[PDB]
Design a protein around this ligand. Sequence first.
Ligand SMILES: Nc1nc2c(ncn2[C@@H]2O[C@H](COP(=O)(O)OP(=O)(O)OP(=O)(O)O)[C@@H](O)[C@H]2O)c(=O)[nH]1
Ligand SMILES: Nc1nc2c(ncn2[C@@H]2O[C@H](COP(=O)(O)OP(=O)(O)OP(=O)(O)O)[C@@H](O)[C@H]2O)c(=O)[nH]1
Lengths: 427, 105, 43, 49, 47, 438, 47
Amino acid sequence: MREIVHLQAGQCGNQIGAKFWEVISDEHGIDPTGTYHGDSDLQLERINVYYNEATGGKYVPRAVLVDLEPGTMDSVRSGPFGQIFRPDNFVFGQSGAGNNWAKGHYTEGAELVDSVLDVVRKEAESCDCLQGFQLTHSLGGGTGSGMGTLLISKIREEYPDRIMNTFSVVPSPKVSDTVVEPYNATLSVHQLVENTDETYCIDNEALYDICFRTLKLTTPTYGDLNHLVSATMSGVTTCLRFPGQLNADLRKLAVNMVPFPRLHFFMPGFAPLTSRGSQQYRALTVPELTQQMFDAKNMMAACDPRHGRYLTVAAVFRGRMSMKEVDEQMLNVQNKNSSYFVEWIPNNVKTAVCDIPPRGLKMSATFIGNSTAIQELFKRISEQFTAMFRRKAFLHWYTGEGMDEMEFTEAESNMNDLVSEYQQYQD
Amino acid sequence: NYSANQYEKAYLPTYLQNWSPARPTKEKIAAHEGYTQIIANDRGHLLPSVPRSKASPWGIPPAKVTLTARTTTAADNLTKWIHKNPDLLNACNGLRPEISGKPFD
Amino acid sequence: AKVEIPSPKDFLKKHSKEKTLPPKKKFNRCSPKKPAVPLRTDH
Amino acid sequence: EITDKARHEAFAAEMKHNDKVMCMAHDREQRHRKQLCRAINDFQQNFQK
Amino acid sequence: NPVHGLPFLPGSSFTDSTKTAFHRSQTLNYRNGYAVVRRPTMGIGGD
Amino acid sequence: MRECISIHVGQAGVQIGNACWELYCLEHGIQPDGQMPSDKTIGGGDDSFNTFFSETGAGKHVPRAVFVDLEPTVVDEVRTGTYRQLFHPEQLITGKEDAANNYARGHYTIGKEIVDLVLDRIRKLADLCTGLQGFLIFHSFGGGTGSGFASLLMERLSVDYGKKSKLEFAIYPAPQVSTAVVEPYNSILTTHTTLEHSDCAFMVDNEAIYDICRRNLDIERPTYTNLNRLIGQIVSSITASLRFDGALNVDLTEFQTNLVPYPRIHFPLATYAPVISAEKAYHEQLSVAEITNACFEPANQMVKCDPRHGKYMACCMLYRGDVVPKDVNAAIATIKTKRTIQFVDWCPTGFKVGINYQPPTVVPGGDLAKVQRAVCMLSNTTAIAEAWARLDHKFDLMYAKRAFVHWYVGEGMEEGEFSEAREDLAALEKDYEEVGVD
Amino acid sequence: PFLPGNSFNRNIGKERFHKSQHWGFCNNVRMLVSENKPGVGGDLLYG
Ligand SMILES: Nc1nc2c(ncn2[C@@H]2O[C@H](COP(=O)(O)OP(=O)(O)OP(=O)(O)O)[C@@H](O)[C@H]2O)c(=O)[nH]1
Ligand SMILES: Nc1nc2c(ncn2[C@@H]2O[C@H](COP(=O)(O)OP(=O)(O)OP(=O)(O)O)[C@@H](O)[C@H]2O)c(=O)[nH]1
């Protein structure tokens, strides 16, 4: 059968996984102790695509936790769901990161890549036939960038036939806290584009605005931000774990989403977000779902595709639907903005329908977007990188590490090439 | 005084808290032949024919730095201001620091 | 075995490490034994 | 099910066997360590007097 | 009696501020040639 | 694991470290004897104290700091104080002869024979520790015994141990107050010797410490205890990340990597915003915005530098207490929009946020207010060169008429060393505007 | 039971450890000296 093993890395990857894994435990309905309480057969049947079985009806997750700083793991292990996580899978180092790409990519990874690959391969023959791998980390995360580039470079040669899914978050455009972050991103994305087959693009500022817009709860927890996104990649995996007249294969999705090789970066889209009174003020209907689904304010990933045009679109629908409404809504949006798409491809929409609603709500959906709105993203970092490299600030650290400016030359060169590639295809 | 095999994680400055590297090590030996003659009498006394370490060992401005971008003339002295002190370049725990940097234009 | 630690010497150059190939797939197809259905408006 | 069940009790009986003695074993050494520590500290100051 | 184990929707949750002191327990240490890991017993602040 | 070592050189550096350790025993609830109550926290020395104290099976919290001194006077009554039982007897390095304010006297005459001993203390501290991120050096530029003795030790600890961090803390010379006129002699001597070895030097000035207190703390009559209370709070706040976690944790390694722009200059400036009397705290409200305005208000800095006369490079804020990401990110965004604030155009971002849940505590018999949200402002600006500019015209006149050299040449130096420091400074000043030039 | 890892040695308060010589030589042959012998720290024998 076809299964999936997860990779969690970076200190954000530490928090997101716990939130990501607790959702899955709850949505399949296992107690915190780990003894599954049989209530839905379908979640009972298709658990083996992500989880293995331990003794006593205990569902051992198939994921690998890697970090350097113990305290984050201690907080995670002390969470309500660390017990389902294996001390075997807790791999880490004896060093502090310094939040540095160079040490995390060359120095400290040297003595940990061996251990981490051993853990993942042990899981690899433990399972039979994977679809691939999915990775939760940050591009602006120092340790996550460091280890991820190492392992994603490796697992290509051993497994060039699988899905190397990458889940990374873009730091805030207005401020990145870390000042060497533009350097870390430029390095990491350069290897990322060579190694990844898929990349999710998410930025925190939108979630702040989403908290302002529909949440309306002033002061949230960062875990709630994790909670908001934890539903996202869960929804795309609901395709695999749940039945319905929809082809769930990410390959069948990716080939529908990848017209040309360099298109790796994609924008999520989620379904009803509702405020205090509007839960009972909302007539939950496919059109108003469809209306809300395609809202520039409903966007959360990077920025408004209003600045550019639409290359390809894929919305997966979760709940009790029919082929009639999804078809007309597709016609509705098609005629709504026919010119906003690219004349290169007509019928750039691919739809999937999941007949199994989530727990709590009936009508739901998810969307992945590939529009011409990523230029602003890496163009923004272009002025930053060209700025910082004009007098090589903070460069003495990496030179002692062995780094030198020549590597940065092609690092910026390719992203310049990507700008034109994104520019030329649409413009 | 050699480095062990395979289990090369249980013996590191990780537990030593060593801030000056202990000793360079290796795992390789050329296939030695030789009846390994004895070349002394009773006292470590090398027979005059065979050679030894011929009384080689018998018994501050140096600091870690990268040249980075500090005026060439100042940097040039620093190199000399690092070296020319064998009393801190030869033996006795090692006495020997490192260096890095990049030139100017 | 002992894993090489990639030293900070170099990495991928301008991402020339890829597989794009625009060839033409020759060998044609099998034989459609069914001939031309009409005879081009003749007797 | 005989094959199925036989595994289940074979594990769990062994499973309950493992942890509890481990819990008890870890408790025992600490207390004796504590009792030795206090015992050393007592006569010595008595000897110091 | 609030609805416990209510729909754990991604959007909203509950809050509490009665917490005063937050100390965490060291469950990780190295301590001899093998890195050795402790069993978590006390949470943040000790519980 | 996550620990560090404190050193206290100069007879001034010992009373301040005393207060710091006096402060540190409160939050852990340490009794003066050296033991907890019957409650179970003792072991091999692993708990909140493991980073700071060494409470082994003996049950005695042993602080990880060495107090070094050259005169038996001020070091003995502390050995007869209230917590002298806590302190390791031979960790409290005393002497019988002074440096007489002379760098070189401490640096040459007495330094050789005592450093070997303290080096033994260093190594027997080094072996017992595990991760030992760096050192906490408490000194003073006008070190009567601090000047010479700190220099030689930081040379010896640098040369043998160079792979870690070294954190330096000295009182900056008062710009218009000088309790010694040989103070410029050794102070510049200390600076030029330390530039090529010191990792992170952090300064402070007593005048503005006094200036603050009768401004808002409203005490026209503070005491050294009050002075030591504020600075001990400063080092407590920065070590709260080691003591407590938060939304994110930061370490001195991040502080070094992210604060210093370029070599040589490694001299940021600390600051603490919620400085206010208890009564003024009582009937007023604290929130992020005003303390963010207060922290960057020019009169709240302990160093006499008009920030408008200079330009900023880095700014580190360490929020200790009950805060949320929403207001702080909005508030700092407004700070970026401000025009009077002038970071260099070179740096787009220069902000390193620290979040810590723990509300900072008051001290019994203290003077501070009761704070829920605190923040520590370690920052570096170009407005500092005036201080050394103040020093050089002070020094250039003095050396031309070469006062007091008869002592210095009298016990074994020459004038070449004094020459070096001036072009060393002339390098630092000339570098300062060059980097100040964009 | 006694399986590997299950052997927890009696490492508790042990103050007396004196050893005897159960065996000996005598005359010109070799044998075990008089049976009545305490063990390590005065330990009784089997029955
Ligand atoms: N876990 C977590 N990460 C956050 C949060 N807010 C922003 N982040 C960012 O998420 C990034 C990813 O974390 P990691 O990849 O583990 O970072 P790292 O390699 O350990 O080093 P740093 O990036 O400097 O933290 C970090 O760089 C943070 O800047 C938050 O609230 N929680
Ligand atoms: N940080 C701090 N500095 C002080 C304190 N009291 C005085 N100072 C200043 O710090 C300087 C300390 O240098 P020294 O006077 O040489 O002190 P010392 O080197 O330890 O030994 P002495 O020469 O005997 O005083 C003095 O010149 C004072 O101006 C204090 O309590 N704390």
